[PDB]
Amino acid sequence: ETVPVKLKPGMDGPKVKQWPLTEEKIKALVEICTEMEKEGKISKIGPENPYNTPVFAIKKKDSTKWRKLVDFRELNKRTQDFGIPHPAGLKKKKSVTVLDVGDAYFSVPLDEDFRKYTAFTIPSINNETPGIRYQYNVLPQGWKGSPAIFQSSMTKILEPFRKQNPDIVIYQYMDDLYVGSDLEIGQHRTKIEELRQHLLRWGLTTELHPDKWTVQPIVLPEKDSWTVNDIQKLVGKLNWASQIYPGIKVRQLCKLLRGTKALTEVIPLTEEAELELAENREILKEPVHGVYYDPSKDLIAEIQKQGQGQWTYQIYQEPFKNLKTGKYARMRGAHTNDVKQLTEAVQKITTESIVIWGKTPKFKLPIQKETWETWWTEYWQATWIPEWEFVNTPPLVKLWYQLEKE
Amino acid sequence: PISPIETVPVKLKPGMDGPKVKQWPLTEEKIKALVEICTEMEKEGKISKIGPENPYNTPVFAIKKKDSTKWRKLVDFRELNKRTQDFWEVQLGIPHPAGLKKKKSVTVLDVGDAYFSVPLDEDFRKYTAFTIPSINIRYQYNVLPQGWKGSPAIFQSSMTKILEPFRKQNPDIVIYQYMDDLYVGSDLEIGQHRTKIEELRQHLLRWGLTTPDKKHQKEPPFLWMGYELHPDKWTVQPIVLPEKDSWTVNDIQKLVGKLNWASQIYPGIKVRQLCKLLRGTKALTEVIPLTEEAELELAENREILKEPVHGVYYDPSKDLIAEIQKQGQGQWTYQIYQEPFKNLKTGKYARMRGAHTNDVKQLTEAVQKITTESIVIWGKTPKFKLPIQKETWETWWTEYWQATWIPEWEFVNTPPLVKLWYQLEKEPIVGAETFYVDGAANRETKLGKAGYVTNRGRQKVVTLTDTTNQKTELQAIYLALQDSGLEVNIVTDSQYALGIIQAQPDQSESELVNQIIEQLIKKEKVYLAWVPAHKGI
Numbered sequence A: 001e002t003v004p005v006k007l008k009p010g011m012d013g014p015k016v017k018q019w020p021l022t023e024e025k026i027k028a029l030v031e032i033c034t035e036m037e038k039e040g041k042i043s044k045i046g047p048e049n050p051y052n053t054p055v056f057a058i059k060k061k062d063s064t065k066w067r068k069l070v071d072f073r074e075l076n077k078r079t080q081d082f083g084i085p086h087p088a089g090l091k092k093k094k095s096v097t098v099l100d101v102g103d104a105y106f107s108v109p110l111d112e113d114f115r116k117y118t119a120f121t122i123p124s125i126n127n128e129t130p131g132i133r134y135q136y137n138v139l140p141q142g143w144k145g146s147p148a149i150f151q152s153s154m155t156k157i158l159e160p161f162r163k164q165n166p167d168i169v170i171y172q173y174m175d176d177l178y179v180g181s182d183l184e185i186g187q188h189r190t191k192i193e194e195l196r197q198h199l200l201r202w203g204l205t206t207e208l209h210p211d212k213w214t215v216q217p218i219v220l221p222e223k224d225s226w227t228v229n230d231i232q233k234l235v236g237k238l239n240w241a242s243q244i245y246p247g248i249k250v251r252q253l254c255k256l257l258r259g260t261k262a263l264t265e266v267i268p269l270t271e272e273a274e275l276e277l278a279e280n281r282e283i284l285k286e287p288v289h290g291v292y293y294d295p296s297k298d299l300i301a302e303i304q305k306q307g308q309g310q311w312t313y314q315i316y317q318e319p320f321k322n323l324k325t326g327k328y329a330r331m332r333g334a335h336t337n338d339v340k341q342l343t344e345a346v347q348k349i350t351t352e353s354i355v356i357w358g359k360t361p362k363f364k365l366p367i368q369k370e371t372w373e374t375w376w377t378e379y380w381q382a383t384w385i386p387e388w389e390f391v392n393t394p395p396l397v398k399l400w401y402q403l404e405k406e
Numbered sequence B: 001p002i003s004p005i006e007t008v009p010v011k012l013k014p015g016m017d018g019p020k021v022k023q024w025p026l027t028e029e030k031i032k033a034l035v036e037i038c039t040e041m042e043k044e045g046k047i048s049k050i051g052p053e054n055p056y057n058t059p060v061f062a063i064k065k066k067d068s069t070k071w072r073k074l075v076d077f078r079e080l081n082k083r084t085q086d087f088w089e090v091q092l093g094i095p096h097p098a099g100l101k102k103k104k105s106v107t108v109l110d111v112g113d114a115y116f117s118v119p120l121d122e123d124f125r126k127y128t129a130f131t132i133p134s135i136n137i138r139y140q141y142n143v144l145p146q147g148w149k150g151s152p153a154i155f156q157s158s159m160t161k162i163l164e165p166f167r168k169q170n171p172d173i174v175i176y177q178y179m180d181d182l183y184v185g186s187d188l189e190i191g192q193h194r195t196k197i198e199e200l201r202q203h204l205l206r207w208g209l210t211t212p213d214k215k216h217q218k219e220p221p222f223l224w225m226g227y228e229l230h231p232d233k234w235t236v237q238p239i240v241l242p243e244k245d246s247w248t249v250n251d252i253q254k255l256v257g258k259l260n261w262a263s264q265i266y267p268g269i270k271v272r273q274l275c276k277l278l279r280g281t282k283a284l285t286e287v288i289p290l291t292e293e294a295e296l297e298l299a300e301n302r303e304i305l306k307e308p309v310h311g312v313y314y315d316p317s318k319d320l321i322a323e324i325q326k327q328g329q330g331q332w333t334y335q336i337y338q339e340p341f342k343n344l345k346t347g348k349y350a351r352m353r354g355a356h357t358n359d360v361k362q363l364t365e366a367v368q369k370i371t372t373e374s375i376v377i378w379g380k381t382p383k384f385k386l387p388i389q390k391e392t393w394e395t396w397w398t399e400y401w402q403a404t405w406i407p408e409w410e411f412v413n414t415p416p417l418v419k420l421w422y423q424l425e426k427e428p429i430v431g432a433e434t435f436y437v438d439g440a441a442n443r444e445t446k447l448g449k450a451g452y453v454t455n456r457g458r459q460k461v462v463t464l465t466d467t468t469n470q471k472t473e474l475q476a477i478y479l480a481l482q483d484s485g486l487e488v489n490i491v492t493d494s495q496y497a498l499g500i501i502q503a504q505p506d507q508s509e510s511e512l513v514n515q516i517i518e519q520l521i522k523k524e525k526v527y528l529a530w531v532p533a534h535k536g537i
């Protein structure tokens, strides 16, 4: 028996255009789809169905086998909401492990009348062939309603491992299961493998470190002698920084800056300026008081290209009231590609948001839409897809976070 | 002939009802004709008579043809089409000639009146109701009606199913449907090819779909959107330009249009002076005196369009090469080929400077655009031969604020190379003079002052009428640049100058910024520094 799923009142199904795909992945999808059709998971559809959702194929980390991924963001946004629990435990765990339990959904049938809305299309190179149109008959991976409907079965399936191991945390966010334990790596890895078998046994098949992620302080430079330029740079940063920490003062230094001196001119600090600075260093030794996460408001992630392979980010809900901030160094191998590094970073950051608040952040990316749209899929390796917008990084915000400690 | 194929379920938009529009009174003759014509398809079972239980109606009129003066009929489904549901995209794009492979032979079967062979959803049929009047006769369609929104869509998918078996049986044959034409190509020997065609023909015939005989069907060369397709190569129809005495504005526009399309295949084509003839045009039909600069240009273009162009098709076993050239500031030409000088495709782009850019950023955008069309056509991206040194690229991209990338490429020394016009110093220049520039203007009165004072005692100030703050600030920076020597340190509090430091643009929409840019380039070493406003600094 199937549960009746509906679109939020007044909405209509998604009619998103398919992005062009490479030969390599069109073939991969054709293969994957013919098979899924045999198994009865999906079915060919005619023109009478006007809806569409983009599809593509990615290759998992350590897996040289193509995996089909759909972009349900639009559908999910139009899909009605529906006990969806998030614990603050794995936030503190010594280790967490993500598990791909997407396969489970394919067993469960999807309400007949909602099926139309899951239409997708495999394109043809040079439009020499019409698109191959399919639609899901079972629960779609990457859809929000799926983990929802599969809830019951899921809880049952896990309860035994749960009750026999309440010292472990298990969190389900869409196609993934986050398993965290403080148990040393030996027991953790072994216990995970055991859990896998526990799942495998039912049919369906499938390291992180939370308490090591610290918000770093903003360290200010230190010289034996300061030049007019050094001071100017320092003052500029502090002045901007006072929007976060209102206790930051800059007048005493600004005083030394009065007078048209050469930038290379060396200036000794007045004892008053020396204090002012020492005082500021203190305020910067810790994050601003008063920042509390609000579940009813969107989470936001800003990323700034720092060059040399470095990237900086800040998760917040209100500008300047950052819940978390961090620095990311490019993965070994992406020594020439920015899109590669950026996507990796986008994923890493999303994961953390999930672990902590169980919610994906809306990204503000320092890249041109065209560049992103063209190559993001090539390096994506997650079942979910967060929201994003493209922006122009204010130079000031960049110079600031460049100052984080190591 | 009607066919025994599953009708596709069709319904009207949510909450809408069928057409109910007035039937024009015709002539005793037009009525005569339509009576005859309708009785024809009536006997064929295409249309059936209906009684008063149908409150819908679509206007039907008569029209004499080109080849016979004999009357044809026309049904105006405009209204019905408004009330009909939407179907998925009919054709998601046309195949570009450069993405085709060569075939030994290509034949097109005109499945002409096939719309009228595919049965319409029985339920929907009622909406197709129409009326043949009298001087002082109801029917409805039982088959896809010429003109109805869903016809092409449904017809296509039908043709798709019907061909699935023949395609499987013959994986060495290529069929491509477009409208009511069926293009079929292959690499089989002419006799074998001829046979398969007939086999297909009889396969479609088995479904009532009539097709033209070997005696009557079409053959190559084919016309495909500007191209002249051959089994061996494609050719561009030498574009004809009308040499005339009196030119009207409208005429110039159309001319510039055709010329612009041409430039994709024929770099060299210019329309700069031809465009000038449009300035201040009061009417579309006003005649314009062709400037001699325009005469020399229009002429030089006829010469270019004399030499035709024939390229080659795509060979999957060969690598794809894309080469790019900068014809001018913001102008790039590219040609994709597999074997040198044997071009598959060519094109060009003109980039309206916009806010503020630089050549390297622009090159990047071309590469990006090319990469996208490549993937659509060949399903893969080309190896790039770019007029830029690996050193230059590395220096720029590693520091640029925005994420950017260029796929596997290789430097090709084809002048003029794109290069970094200037690079601001990372730290203050020792020895160099230091200009503390500042500018302010009254927003409302548009009155301002711009100036500077240096660590060497030099100073200046200028009063500006009809200026804005941003202009003043930049102007301050311009002056500092003018009066400074080869090496300069400049401090400003301008929020907009922060942009230049980060982006280091070599072109902008603002002529003023451009002035500053020219000056920056002239300098040997420039160090720009920003400081917050209204402070000590």
Ligand SMILES: Cc1occc1C(=S)Nc1ccc(Cl)c(/C=N/OC(C)(C)C)c1
Pocket: A128, B095, B100, B101, B102, B103, B106, B174, B175, B176, B178, B183, B184, B185, B186, B220, B222, B224, B229, B230, B231, B232
């Ligand atoms: C997709 C296709 O349909 C029929 C032939 C072909 C191919 S791959 N090669 C090819 C080779 C020579 C010619 Cl002349 C044409 C004709 N193409 O016409 C269209 C683009 C309508 C298929 C096509």
